C-alpha cells in the first residue's frame, strides 16, 4: 500500500483543514456517546447505536485523510494544465475513493446524458472547478453532504 | 486530539521511512494470514490468530505513524541546543507515546540509580543521542526490537 498523490500547496492545507474539523467533530461525537451511555444505561436503544456509528463514521474519515496526508507530494506552483471550458476533468473524493468525471462546457451544451456529463460553464460545479489544476481539491455541493474532490487529471 | 509534533528535517524522513518500512510488514503479513486462511480451515490454531494479531499490530503501528507525520511541524534547520555531555534528554516512543528521561555523562559517572540515569558517553544510546537536537529521531537498540524514539526536549 505505498502509492503518491499529488497536491498543490492549496490543495493540500484544503485536506488539512479538513482534517483539522472533523477531529474537532470527534471530540464532540466521543463526548455525546459518553453522555448518551451513562444517562440510557440500556444501549439497545436506536440512539447509542446511531451514535455508535457516527463516531466510527468520523474514524474513518479521519484515519482516511491522515493516509492521503501521508503519501502527499506537492507540486511546483505553475504547473500542469488549467481547466478550462471543454476541459474533461477527472476527480477521487479522498475518503471513499469515488472517481468522477465531468466536462465543463457551455450552459447550452451541458447534457446529463453524454459519456463525461456536460456540466455548463455557469453552473455551480463548473464554477467551482473552472481555474483549477491537477492536485488542487474542491468543495462541492450535495444534497446528502458538501464533499471534497481532489482534481486527478484534466484530460480535456 | 489537536497537538503539534515538532521534528527536525531528519527526524521527519526517518517516520517517514519507518513507515515505509511498517506498510512493507503488512503486505507480507497481509499475504501470510491470507495463505493460512486457505491451508489450515481450523482458524482455531494458535496460527492463524498469532497471524491476525500481528497483522492488527502493523496496522496500529501504521496508523499511530499517519497520525504524528499528520502533526509534524518541521523546525528551522540550526535550531534549539544540541545533546552533549552533561546535557539531560527526555525522549517519547511515537508509537506507546512513552517518555523516557537520560543523561549523557562520562563512562564513570554512569549510574543507573541516579533520577535521570546516568548513561556513559561512549555507551550505545549515549553516542546515539550526542549531536542531536529537539525534533530528532533516534533509533535505539532493545532486546524486544529497536524502537525510534524522539527528542522532546533537552533540559540539560
Ligand atoms: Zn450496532
Ligand atoms: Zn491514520
Ligand atoms: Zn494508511
Ligand atoms: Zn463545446
Ligand atoms: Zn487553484
Ligand atoms: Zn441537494
Ligand atoms: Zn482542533
Ligand atoms: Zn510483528
Ligand atoms: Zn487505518
Ligand atoms: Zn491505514
Ligand atoms: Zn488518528
Ligand atoms: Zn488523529
Known sequence: MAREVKLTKAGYERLMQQLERERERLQEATKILQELMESSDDYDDSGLEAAKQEKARIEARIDSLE????????????????????????????????????????????????TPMKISDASPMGKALLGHRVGDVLSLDTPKGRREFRVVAIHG
Open 67 to 114: 493516509d492521503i496526508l501521508s503519501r502527499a507530494v506537492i507540486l511546483e506552483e505553475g504547473s500542469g494544465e488549467v481547466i478550462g471550458l471543454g476541459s474533461v476533468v477527472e476527480l477521487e473524493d479522498p475518503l471513499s475513493g469515488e472517481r468522477l468525471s465531468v466536462q465543463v462546457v457551455s450552459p447550452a451544451e451541458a447534457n446529463v446524458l453524454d
